[PDB]
Design a protein around this ligand. Structure first.
Ligand code: SAH
Ligand code: SAU
Ligand code: K
Ligand code: K
Ligand code: NA
Length: 352
């Protein structure tokens, strides 16, 4: 026979399923709160605001106040926003994690939120079954959903190119302080550095400002360098890192190697090794290290990014043992990991 239930089933376990089913509601309610700029209206106001007060400052008019109330009720329940009775009125304030929704500091996450929750950029996730049950197709889910591989897609869609680049610029802003303060000695002795796949230059503009002695270069594909500002003192070069890595004292790669399969990473890493001097040259990798055995605050999002790479780029997020095999296979002498209390860690890879 089958299981026969004879008493009340657990509500909490059913609610766990419902909450996972509706996970996307947290994503897309958060998207709307960002688009409405609620956190910044309140933060600029400097104290909790009534529904009416909030409405007057919203990005467009008119405002459906019943809808706004109901979205605020949901955001209160997420514990991003607060609601309380003050002097005879209901007033909406910010909870502590809403600080990341507030503009004007390095940990504001708004760019990354608008990129990741974009409708077209979410589409590949609908093709996850197809990533396992391939039917012999070797295309990424991104190509199944949007027509071609991610990099050529950005080349062909300027508005999406800009959205993607600004999400990565934001992710870079989140780490740059910890990188230039905690890892300052990594930049000792260096006179030149190339950020390979450096995006629209957030990382190099920050390194250049912190280390005015170092001649910095950003290097990426033409359509990304075309979405970047021009500065006289930083070199901007375009090209294909699979064919050319510029000789420099140090090469850096942030959120690059997680886009590629093992063979491709080894090829990239070998070319980076050949580009730096035997005397003090180093390759600085910034990417996730997946823990195998313990849970950390960013564990859940690092596993999420593992699937994101699987679907969107064809890459993966790697454990330390996997990083070790790759760096070994590329012919380096060894590596050193530095944690910077971020999603990614720093891995210095040292040639002979
Ligand atoms: N063949 C190639 N050569 C150079 N850059 C490449 C490339 N293929 C992809 N890229 C670049 O790799 C970057 C991956 S996203 C990471 C960007 C930046 N380093 C950051 O962390 O914010 C993109 O900017 C993409 O345009
Ligand atoms: C995870 N992702 C997937 C994307 C993606 C796209 C386009 C952009 C992105 C993206 C852009 C910025 C990001 C920034 C991030 C991040 C993830 C992303 C991110 O996690 C850490 O900070 O096409 C479908 O898939
Ligand atoms: K969707
Ligand atoms: K982890
Ligand atoms: Na139920």
């Amino acid at each position: 026979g089958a299981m026969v239930m004879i008493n009340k089933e657990n509500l909490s376990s059913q609610a766990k399923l419902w909450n996972f089913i509706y996970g996307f509601a947290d994503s897309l309610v958060l998207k709307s709160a960002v688009q409405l700029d609620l956190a910044n209206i309140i933060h600029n106001h400097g104290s909790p605001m009534t529904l009416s007060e909030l409405s007057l400052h919203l990005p467009s008019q008119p405002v459906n106040q019943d809808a706004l109330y109901r979205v605020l009720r949901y955001l209160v329940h997420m514990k991003l926003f607060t609601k309380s009775s003050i002097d005879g009125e209901l007033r909406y304030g910010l909870a502590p994690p809403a600080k990341f929704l507030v503009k004007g500091w390095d940990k504001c996450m708004l760019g990354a939120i608008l990129t990741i929750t974009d409708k077209d950029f979410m589409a590949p996730w609908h093709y996850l079954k197809e990533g396992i049950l391939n039917d012999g197709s070797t295309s990424t889910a991104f190509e199944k959903a949007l027509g071609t591989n991610i990099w050529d897609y950005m080349a062909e869609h300027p508005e999406k190119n800009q959205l993607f680049n600004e999400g990565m610029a934001n992710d870079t802003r989140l780490i740059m302080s910890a990188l230039v303060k905690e890892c300052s000695s990594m930049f000792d002795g260096i006179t030149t550095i190339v950020d390979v796949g450096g995006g629209t230059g957030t990382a190099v503009r920050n390194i250049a400002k912190a280390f005015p002695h170092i001649k910095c270069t950003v290097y990426d594909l033409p359509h990304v360098i075309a979405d970047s500002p021009g500065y006289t003192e930083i070199n901007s070069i375009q090209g294909d890192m699979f064919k050319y890595i510029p000789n420099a004292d140090a090469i850096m790669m942030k959120c690059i190697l997680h886009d590629w399969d093992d063979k491709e990473c080894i090829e990239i890493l070998k070319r980076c090794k050949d580009a730096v001097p035997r005397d003090g040259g180093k390759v600085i990798i910034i990417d996730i290290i997946l823990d195998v055995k313990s849970e950390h605050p960013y564990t859940k999002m690092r596993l999420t990014l593992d699937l994101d790479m699987m679907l969107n780029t064809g890459g993966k997020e790697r454990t330390e043992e996997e990083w070790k095999k790759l760096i070994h296979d590329a012919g380096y002498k060894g590596y050193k990991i530095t944690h910077i209390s971020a999603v990614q860690s720093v891995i210095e890879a040292y040639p002979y």
